[PDB]
């Protein structure tokens, strides 16, 4: 593997993430979430958009064709010419990270030299609901039947099977809001976030007003064990999974600009990160939350590393039950995980998460300096999968600062 | 025979059947995909746990549900829980995109073996927009043009480039004639996996077991006269009809790819070699021109000239654009869709790009070493083209027992 052939990240950005239905993107079309982050990649690197080989968008809930069309339209809004192709990918909860891995694979394979891996979801717009009938033949395959379990039921399965208590779950949620509030106040999301200029429509009156959205509106600084303790189980009468220890339903987008190192160098673009490895593995659909416990070791091993060699993690907080389980199972230092908070506090627009987390991870690794050399993005995946990617810290920031 | 080449060791498809009225009208999408996934591992005697990913190109359904359905299909096919699955969507090219994604992943070192597949049940999933359109589209002409009916872009191509009604209808006549001849000669037997399913009789309401083994959309009695009776579908004065457009269909295709060195280790004969892939953007208003741009790109990348291509599978989305692309590129009509195309056998959107790899490679196999290079290509809704160059595999010639 030649140095100049490394797949590097030269920019990684995200919209704020907002609460679906009631939050600040409730009246914002999906294409208007994606376009700003696509445009930002171009504008921040001064890249001619015609040089982009593909735009790959992880996105989960919408009718396939309409959403792929919306992504094409977003690229046009963002100033891309007709010559730049666009596509979507779906590996459920991992889709945004899958998109980034697809671009890395395509560059490594010599399909093109520059690509955009993005993620997009408007959970305001698209409900999570099965349409039409289920093949009765599913009765013959128990694991296929288990693909139909509500995600929240798999959460309860994990908590029950592995003994994750209500307090452990709620504590993780308290920690997520604390860290997210602290990071926001400390300016730690300023670099990654692209503010979105949109509007709010009053359903009561019909009045519209503009708003510029810059912060993740799901963070609740008053979240405590006591407040979380009052919430009722959502999926099981004597259960432990609640709205307060599950990811938030959210709207948002993320985008990452990747290219061959040699191309970045020729263009004089500071390197934010280097893509190293990616793993996507199957696990029991009934306990899909265990995904990261299997995927992280796979990706880390592929990189020639051990778990102790990873300095920072973005492990999605789909449910506190499975987040806590994975952290404990892998024996990871809690202080190295979701250091600026996670999806319980800032939300989980399904397709956006995997891509936006690359931005959150890399910008944090950037700020933490050269010792924060390796980072992992990982998440569990509905229907029983885990994905993980290993990234290496770029030196662009240091070279600029010490110029 | 470089050990790192991405090779195809098996490529198969279901029959393709007319949506709503054809033989898969009562067949769930998972039951279209499962048989082809199973066939890939049975025919190669491969333990399914060795497959690194199953990537399914599929277009019309709600994303999450269909990705779930694909995981379910893999379970039906006998794959273990450890094998991951995902879907991709680049509209009409999705099935070919899936194959390219697997080739890229293998080349990149992500895994050594993968399945690229395509699936569509157009019986199950309508092509209709949901919710409102963003008012912003009015400010971006090219974005607005993404909302044009595919059939309107067909008219745009026919009018702009002067493709007559007769030229369009003749391509359809040819497609049915070739498909009929190929079916009768048994030329689809290698690629087709018969599907055991159920059919509800439209007149009696009885349910019967059937085995579907042939494409049910072929109409050997198709003539210029019969096509002439048809009325334009998209414009009152149009030349695009149901008869010179692809059929709306249900079906699936799947391709098993691996590093050459792994195929060699396992003693698996090589059906084809993946060489190059291009996906390019074009004017949405004339999306049908996709192949005229994508084919030269993929061929150039492979170090070849157009004349070096021995066989083409260029999707017959609309005779208008099919004829345009054939003419624009100056291709030998005799080397394109030699066993018929989508006007005769159908176009289940996501399945087409994958099933065409099977159609292409099995024909290159039968045609012998002279048929060395082939291309799969198609236009893409919203204004893209895709093309892949494949090389004919040497099959048993490279094995230990050669």
Coordinates of C-alpha atoms in Angstrom, one line a residue, chain B residues 4-396:
Chain B
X4 CA -5.9 -10.1 -7.5
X5 CA -8.3 -9.8 -10.5
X6 CA -12.0 -9.9 -9.5
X7 CA -13.6 -12.9 -11.2
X8 CA -17.2 -14.1 -11.5
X9 CA -17.5 -17.7 -10.7
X10 CA -21.3 -17.9 -11.1
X11 CA -24.1 -15.6 -12.5
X12 CA -27.7 -16.5 -12.5
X13 CA -31.2 -15.0 -12.8
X14 CA -34.9 -15.9 -12.2
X15 CA -37.1 -15.9 -15.2
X16 CA -38.5 -12.3 -15.6
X17 CA -42.3 -12.1 -15.6
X18 CA -44.9 -9.5 -16.5
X19 CA -45.9 -7.5 -13.4
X20 CA -49.5 -7.7 -12.1
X21 CA -50.6 -10.3 -14.6
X22 CA -47.6 -12.6 -15.0
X23 CA -46.3 -15.7 -13.3
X24 CA -44.7 -13.9 -10.3
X25 CA -47.7 -11.8 -9.6
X26 CA -48.3 -13.7 -6.3
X27 CA -44.6 -14.1 -5.5
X28 CA -43.0 -12.1 -2.7
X29 CA -39.8 -10.2 -3.4
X30 CA -37.8 -12.4 -0.9
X31 CA -38.9 -15.5 -2.8
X32 CA -37.5 -14.0 -6.0
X33 CA -34.1 -13.3 -4.5
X34 CA -33.6 -16.4 -2.4
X35 CA -33.5 -18.9 -5.2
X36 CA -30.7 -17.0 -7.0
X37 CA -28.7 -16.6 -3.8
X38 CA -29.1 -20.3 -3.1
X39 CA -28.1 -21.2 -6.6
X40 CA -24.8 -19.3 -6.4
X41 CA -23.6 -21.3 -3.3
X42 CA -25.0 -24.7 -4.5
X43 CA -23.4 -24.5 -7.9
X44 CA -20.0 -23.6 -6.4
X45 CA -20.2 -25.8 -3.3
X46 CA -19.3 -22.8 -1.2
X47 CA -20.0 -22.5 2.5
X48 CA -22.2 -19.4 2.6
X49 CA -20.4 -18.1 5.8
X50 CA -17.4 -17.3 3.5
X51 CA -19.4 -14.6 1.7
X52 CA -18.3 -11.2 2.8
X53 CA -21.4 -9.2 1.8
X54 CA -24.6 -9.5 -0.2
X55 CA -25.2 -6.3 -2.1
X56 CA -28.7 -6.0 -3.7
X57 CA -29.6 -3.4 -6.3
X58 CA -33.3 -2.6 -5.9
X59 CA -35.2 0.6 -6.7
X60 CA -38.9 1.1 -5.8
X61 CA -39.7 -0.1 -2.3
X62 CA -39.4 1.7 1.0
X63 CA -35.7 1.4 1.9
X64 CA -35.7 -0.2 5.3
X65 CA -38.4 -2.7 4.6
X66 CA -36.7 -3.9 1.4
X67 CA -33.3 -4.2 3.1
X68 CA -35.0 -6.3 5.7
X69 CA -36.6 -8.4 3.0
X70 CA -33.2 -9.0 1.5
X71 CA -31.8 -10.2 4.8
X72 CA -34.9 -12.5 5.1
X73 CA -34.2 -13.8 1.6
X74 CA -30.6 -14.6 2.5
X75 CA -31.9 -16.6 5.5
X76 CA -34.3 -18.5 3.2
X77 CA -31.4 -19.2 0.9
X78 CA -29.5 -20.9 3.7
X79 CA -27.0 -18.1 4.6
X80 CA -26.0 -17.9 8.3
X81 CA -26.6 -14.8 10.5
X82 CA -23.0 -13.8 10.1
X83 CA -23.3 -12.8 6.5
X84 CA -24.2 -9.1 6.1
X85 CA -26.6 -7.7 3.5
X86 CA -27.3 -4.2 2.1
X87 CA -29.1 -2.6 -0.8
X88 CA -28.0 0.0 -3.3
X89 CA -30.0 2.3 -5.5
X90 CA -28.8 4.1 -8.7
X91 CA -32.2 3.7 -10.2
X92 CA -32.2 1.6 -13.4
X93 CA -28.5 0.6 -13.0
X94 CA -28.9 -0.6 -9.4
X95 CA -28.2 -4.3 -10.2
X96 CA -25.0 -3.5 -12.1
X97 CA -24.0 -1.0 -9.4
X98 CA -24.3 -3.8 -6.9
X99 CA -21.8 -6.0 -8.9
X100 CA -19.4 -3.0 -9.2
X101 CA -19.7 -2.4 -5.5
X102 CA -18.7 -5.9 -4.7
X103 CA -15.8 -5.7 -7.2
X104 CA -14.6 -2.5 -5.6
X105 CA -14.8 -4.0 -2.1
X106 CA -12.8 -7.0 -3.1
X107 CA -10.2 -4.9 -4.9
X108 CA -10.0 -2.7 -1.8
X109 CA -9.3 -5.6 0.5
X110 CA -12.6 -5.4 2.4
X111 CA -13.3 -9.2 1.8
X112 CA -12.4 -11.8 -0.8
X113 CA -15.9 -13.1 -1.8
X114 CA -19.1 -11.2 -2.3
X115 CA -22.5 -11.4 -4.0
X116 CA -23.8 -8.6 -6.2
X117 CA -27.5 -9.0 -6.9
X118 CA -30.6 -7.2 -8.2
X119 CA -34.2 -7.5 -7.3
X120 CA -37.5 -5.9 -8.3
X121 CA -41.1 -6.8 -7.9
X122 CA -42.9 -4.2 -9.9
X123 CA -46.1 -6.0 -9.0
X124 CA -45.5 -5.1 -5.4
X125 CA -44.1 -1.6 -5.7
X126 CA -45.6 1.2 -7.7
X127 CA -43.5 4.0 -9.3
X128 CA -45.3 7.0 -7.6
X129 CA -44.0 10.0 -5.8
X130 CA -45.1 10.4 -2.2
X131 CA -45.7 13.7 -0.3
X132 CA -45.2 17.1 -1.7
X133 CA -42.4 18.4 -4.0
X134 CA -40.0 21.0 -2.6
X135 CA -41.1 24.3 -4.1
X136 CA -37.4 25.1 -4.5
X137 CA -37.3 22.8 -7.6
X138 CA -38.8 25.7 -9.6
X139 CA -35.5 27.6 -9.2
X140 CA -33.3 24.8 -10.5
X141 CA -34.2 23.7 -14.0
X142 CA -32.1 20.5 -13.9
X143 CA -33.6 19.5 -10.5
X144 CA -37.1 20.1 -12.0
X145 CA -36.2 17.9 -14.9
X146 CA -35.5 15.1 -12.5
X147 CA -39.3 14.9 -12.0
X148 CA -40.0 14.3 -15.7
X149 CA -41.7 10.9 -16.5
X150 CA -39.2 8.5 -17.9
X151 CA -41.5 8.2 -20.9
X152 CA -41.4 11.9 -21.5
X153 CA -37.6 11.8 -21.6
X154 CA -38.0 9.0 -24.2
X155 CA -40.0 11.5 -26.3
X156 CA -37.3 14.1 -25.8
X157 CA -34.7 11.7 -27.2
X158 CA -36.8 10.6 -30.1
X159 CA -37.6 14.2 -31.1
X160 CA -34.2 15.8 -30.5
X161 CA -32.2 13.1 -32.2
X162 CA -34.8 12.1 -34.9
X163 CA -35.6 8.5 -34.0
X164 CA -38.7 7.6 -36.0
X165 CA -41.7 5.5 -34.9
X166 CA -40.6 2.8 -37.4
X167 CA -37.1 2.7 -36.0
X168 CA -38.4 2.3 -32.5
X169 CA -41.0 -0.3 -33.3
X170 CA -38.4 -2.2 -35.4
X171 CA -36.1 -2.5 -32.4
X172 CA -39.1 -4.1 -30.5
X173 CA -39.8 -6.5 -33.3
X174 CA -36.2 -7.5 -33.3
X175 CA -36.1 -7.9 -29.5
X176 CA -39.1 -10.3 -29.4
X177 CA -37.8 -12.2 -32.4
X178 CA -34.4 -12.7 -30.8
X179 CA -35.9 -13.6 -27.4
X180 CA -38.2 -16.1 -28.9
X181 CA -35.4 -17.8 -30.8
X182 CA -33.1 -17.8 -27.8
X183 CA -35.8 -19.4 -25.6
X184 CA -36.6 -22.1 -28.2
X185 CA -32.9 -22.8 -28.7
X186 CA -32.5 -23.2 -24.9
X187 CA -30.0 -20.4 -24.6
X188 CA -31.4 -19.2 -21.3
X189 CA -31.2 -22.6 -19.7
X190 CA -27.8 -22.1 -18.1
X191 CA -28.5 -18.7 -16.6
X192 CA -32.1 -19.3 -15.4
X193 CA -32.9 -20.7 -12.0
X194 CA -36.4 -22.0 -12.1
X195 CA -38.6 -20.7 -9.3
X196 CA -41.1 -22.9 -7.4
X197 CA -44.0 -20.6 -6.3
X198 CA -47.8 -20.2 -6.3
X199 CA -50.1 -18.6 -8.7
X200 CA -53.7 -17.5 -8.1
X201 CA -55.7 -18.1 -11.3
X202 CA -57.2 -14.7 -12.3
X203 CA -60.4 -16.4 -13.5
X204 CA -61.1 -19.2 -11.1
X205 CA -59.4 -17.9 -7.9
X206 CA -57.8 -21.3 -7.3
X207 CA -54.2 -21.4 -6.1
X208 CA -51.8 -23.8 -7.8
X209 CA -48.1 -24.6 -7.4
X210 CA -46.1 -23.6 -10.4
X211 CA -42.5 -23.8 -11.5
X212 CA -41.6 -20.8 -13.5
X213 CA -38.7 -21.5 -15.9
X214 CA -39.1 -19.1 -18.8
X215 CA -39.6 -15.4 -19.4
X216 CA -43.4 -14.9 -19.8
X217 CA -43.4 -11.5 -21.6
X218 CA -42.1 -12.6 -25.0
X219 CA -44.5 -12.2 -27.9
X220 CA -43.3 -13.9 -31.0
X221 CA -46.2 -12.5 -33.1
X222 CA -44.9 -8.9 -32.6
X223 CA -44.7 -7.1 -35.9
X224 CA -44.5 -3.5 -37.2
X225 CA -48.2 -3.7 -37.8
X226 CA -49.1 -4.9 -34.3
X227 CA -46.9 -2.3 -32.7
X228 CA -48.5 0.3 -35.0
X229 CA -51.9 -0.2 -33.4
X230 CA -50.5 1.0 -30.0
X231 CA -51.3 4.5 -28.9
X232 CA -48.6 6.9 -27.3
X233 CA -48.6 6.7 -23.5
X234 CA -46.9 9.8 -22.4
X235 CA -47.9 12.5 -24.9
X236 CA -50.9 12.8 -27.1
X237 CA -48.7 13.1 -30.1
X238 CA -45.9 10.8 -28.9
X239 CA -44.1 8.0 -30.5
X240 CA -43.3 6.1 -27.3
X241 CA -45.8 3.3 -26.7
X242 CA -46.1 0.3 -24.3
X243 CA -44.8 -1.7 -27.3
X244 CA -41.5 0.1 -27.8
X245 CA -40.8 0.5 -24.1
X246 CA -39.4 -2.0 -21.6
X247 CA -42.0 -4.2 -19.9
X248 CA -42.9 -3.7 -16.3
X249 CA -41.6 -6.9 -14.7
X250 CA -40.7 -9.0 -11.6
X251 CA -37.4 -10.9 -11.2
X252 CA -34.0 -11.1 -9.7
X253 CA -30.4 -11.7 -10.6
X254 CA -27.2 -12.6 -8.6
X255 CA -23.5 -12.8 -9.3
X256 CA -20.8 -14.5 -7.1
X257 CA -17.5 -12.7 -7.3
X258 CA -14.2 -13.4 -5.7
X259 CA -10.4 -12.8 -5.9
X260 CA -9.0 -15.0 -8.7
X261 CA -6.5 -16.6 -6.3
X262 CA -9.4 -17.7 -4.2
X263 CA -11.3 -19.2 -7.1
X264 CA -8.1 -20.9 -8.1
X265 CA -7.6 -22.3 -4.6
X266 CA -11.1 -23.6 -4.6
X267 CA -10.9 -25.1 -8.1
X268 CA -13.8 -23.0 -9.4
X269 CA -14.0 -22.3 -13.1
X270 CA -14.0 -18.6 -14.0
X271 CA -17.1 -17.4 -15.9
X272 CA -15.9 -13.8 -16.4
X273 CA -13.5 -11.2 -15.2
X274 CA -14.6 -7.8 -14.0
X275 CA -12.5 -5.1 -15.8
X276 CA -14.0 -1.6 -15.5
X277 CA -17.1 0.3 -14.4
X278 CA -18.3 3.9 -15.2
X279 CA -21.2 5.8 -13.8
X280 CA -21.6 9.2 -15.4
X281 CA -24.2 12.0 -15.2
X282 CA -26.1 13.4 -18.1
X283 CA -29.0 15.9 -18.8
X284 CA -32.0 14.5 -16.8
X285 CA -34.3 15.6 -19.7
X286 CA -32.6 13.2 -22.0
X287 CA -31.5 10.5 -19.6
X288 CA -31.7 7.9 -22.3
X289 CA -28.4 9.0 -23.7
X290 CA -26.6 7.5 -20.7
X291 CA -25.0 4.6 -22.5
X292 CA -23.6 6.8 -25.2
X293 CA -21.5 8.5 -22.5
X294 CA -20.9 5.6 -20.1
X295 CA -19.8 3.0 -22.6
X296 CA -16.9 5.1 -24.1
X297 CA -15.8 5.8 -20.5
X298 CA -15.7 2.2 -19.3
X299 CA -14.1 1.0 -22.6
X300 CA -11.5 3.7 -22.4
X301 CA -10.7 2.8 -18.8
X302 CA -10.2 -0.9 -19.8
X303 CA -7.6 0.2 -22.4
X304 CA -9.9 -0.8 -25.3
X305 CA -11.6 0.8 -28.3
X306 CA -15.3 0.3 -29.1
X307 CA -14.4 -2.1 -31.9
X308 CA -12.8 -4.4 -29.3
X309 CA -16.1 -5.1 -27.7
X310 CA -17.6 -8.4 -28.9
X311 CA -21.0 -8.4 -27.1
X312 CA -23.3 -5.8 -25.5
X313 CA -26.2 -6.0 -23.1
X314 CA -27.6 -2.4 -23.5
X315 CA -30.9 -2.1 -21.7
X316 CA -33.9 -1.5 -23.8
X317 CA -35.5 1.1 -21.5
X318 CA -37.1 2.7 -24.5
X319 CA -36.5 1.9 -28.2
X320 CA -35.9 5.7 -28.7
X321 CA -32.8 5.8 -26.6
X322 CA -31.7 2.3 -27.3
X323 CA -31.6 3.1 -31.0
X324 CA -30.0 6.5 -30.4
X325 CA -27.2 5.0 -28.3
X326 CA -26.6 2.2 -30.8
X327 CA -26.4 4.7 -33.7
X328 CA -24.4 7.3 -31.8
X329 CA -21.7 4.9 -30.9
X330 CA -21.8 3.2 -34.3
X331 CA -22.2 -0.3 -32.8
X332 CA -22.9 -3.4 -34.8
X333 CA -26.6 -4.1 -34.2
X334 CA -25.8 -7.8 -34.5
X335 CA -23.7 -7.7 -31.3
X336 CA -26.3 -6.1 -29.0
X337 CA -28.9 -8.0 -26.9
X338 CA -28.4 -11.1 -29.1
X339 CA -30.9 -13.1 -27.1
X340 CA -33.4 -10.3 -26.9
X341 CA -33.8 -7.5 -24.5
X342 CA -36.1 -5.7 -22.0
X343 CA -38.8 -4.9 -24.6
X344 CA -39.4 -8.6 -25.0
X345 CA -38.3 -10.1 -21.6
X346 CA -38.8 -7.2 -19.3
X347 CA -37.1 -4.7 -17.0
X348 CA -37.6 -5.3 -13.2
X349 CA -35.7 -2.2 -12.4
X350 CA -33.2 -3.4 -9.8
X351 CA -32.8 -6.9 -11.3
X352 CA -31.8 -5.8 -14.8
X353 CA -28.3 -4.7 -14.2
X354 CA -27.4 -8.0 -12.4
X355 CA -29.4 -10.4 -14.6
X356 CA -27.7 -8.8 -17.6
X357 CA -24.3 -9.9 -16.3
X358 CA -25.6 -13.4 -16.4
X359 CA -27.1 -13.1 -19.9
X360 CA -23.9 -11.5 -21.2
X361 CA -21.4 -13.9 -19.6
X362 CA -23.3 -17.1 -20.5
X363 CA -23.5 -16.0 -24.1
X364 CA -19.8 -15.0 -24.2
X365 CA -19.1 -18.5 -22.8
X366 CA -21.1 -20.3 -25.5
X367 CA -19.6 -18.1 -28.3
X368 CA -16.1 -19.2 -27.3
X369 CA -12.8 -17.4 -27.0
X370 CA -13.5 -15.0 -30.0
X371 CA -16.1 -13.4 -27.8
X372 CA -13.6 -12.0 -25.4
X373 CA -15.0 -8.6 -24.2
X374 CA -18.5 -7.7 -23.3
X375 CA -20.3 -4.6 -21.9
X376 CA -23.4 -4.2 -19.8
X377 CA -24.8 -0.7 -19.9
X378 CA -28.0 1.2 -19.3
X379 CA -29.6 4.6 -19.1
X380 CA -30.6 5.8 -15.7
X381 CA -33.6 7.9 -14.5
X382 CA -32.7 11.4 -13.4
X383 CA -29.9 11.5 -15.9
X384 CA -27.1 9.0 -15.6
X385 CA -25.5 6.2 -17.6
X386 CA -23.6 3.2 -16.3
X387 CA -21.4 0.6 -18.1
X388 CA -19.1 -2.2 -17.1
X389 CA -16.6 -4.1 -19.2
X390 CA -16.2 -7.8 -18.6
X391 CA -13.7 -10.3 -20.1
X392 CA -14.7 -13.9 -20.9
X393 CA -13.5 -16.4 -18.4
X394 CA -11.3 -19.3 -19.3
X395 CA -13.4 -21.8 -17.3
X396 CA -12.0 -25.2 -16.8

